[model samples]
Target: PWATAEYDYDAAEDNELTFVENDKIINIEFVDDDWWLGELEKDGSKGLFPSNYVSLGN
Candidate 1:
C-alpha cells in the first residue's frame, strides 16, 4: 500500500520519515501494528513513521 503525508513531520529519530509538507506521496514498505516502513518518493529514502501521519494514496 501507498499513502500521502497529511502533515509535515520532522523525524525525531534516525531513519524516521520527514516531510516538508502535507500530501507528499510515500511508498508503504512494511506494516506492524501502529508503525509502518515508508519510503519517500522525493528521495527514495526509507524510514519508519506512525501510520496516522499519512492517508491512503492512489
Candidate 2:
C-alpha cells in the first residue's frame, strides 16, 4: 500500500479542520510548529494524525 500522511498547516495562521478529506471546515484554530499531538481516532479507530505530537484537536 502507498504511504499516506496528513498535511501540516503552515500558513502562519489558524487553520480550519475538516472531518472530511479536503473539505472546507469552519473550525479554525491556531497550532504551533513544535506541537506534537498523538494519533487521532476516527470512527473509533486509529487513523491519520495531525502534524504536531501535542494534542490540539480537542
Candidate 3:
C-alpha cells in the first residue's frame, strides 16, 4: 500500500518518518490509530508517521 503526503512531516522521534509534501510513502502498515509504519520512496527510509497526515492513493 501507498499514500502521498498532504503536508510536510517532521519526525518528532528517531523512529518517526520525516517527509515533505507530495512525498510518496510506501508499505503503510498500521500499528495504532495515530501512527503507522511506512517507508519514504525518495530517501529509502522506513518509519512511522501519523496516518491522518497522508491521503491514501487510489
Candidate 4:
C-alpha cells in the first residue's frame, strides 16, 4: 500500500502494488505467505503496482 496519494518507489526494493488516490495503507499481516493478497481494510477503492518496486525515501 502507499502512504501518500501520488508517491514514487525506488527500483531497488520490492513493491507489488501501486495504491491510487485515497487508497488506504494497512498493515499486511500475511505479506510473506500471501504476496499478492494483502490484508488491509478495503476502502472501496483499488490500486495497481509492479513487483520489485520500493519507496524512494527511507
Among all candidates shown, the one with the greatest TM-score: 3
| Model 3 lDDT tens row, 1-58 | 8999999999999999999899999989988999999999898899999998899983
Model 4 gets an lDDT of: 0.35
lDDT of each: 0.76, 0.29, 0.93, 0.35
1-58 per-residue lDDT for model 4 (tens digits): 4333234422233434445444444443233432323322355322233322322112
Ranking by lDDT: 3, 1, 4, 2
- RMSD (Å) of each candidate, 1 decimal: 1.8, 12.2, 1.0, 7.9
Model 3 CA deviation exceeding 4 Å by range = none
Model 4 residue pairs with clashes: 10-54, 15-53, 18-48, 18-49
lDDT of 1 by residue, 1-58 (tens): 6787877878899978787655455668666878888888888888888877788874
- lDDT string for model 2 (1-58, tens) is 1112234333332332223333222222334454322222333322223444222232
For lDDT, candidate 2 versus 3, the one ahead is 3
Listed in order, each prediction's TM-score against the native is: 0.78, 0.20, 0.93, 0.26
Kindly report which residue pairs in candidate 3 clash with one another. none
Give lDDT: candidate 1, residue 44: 83
Whichever of 3 and 4 has more TM-score, that candidate is 3
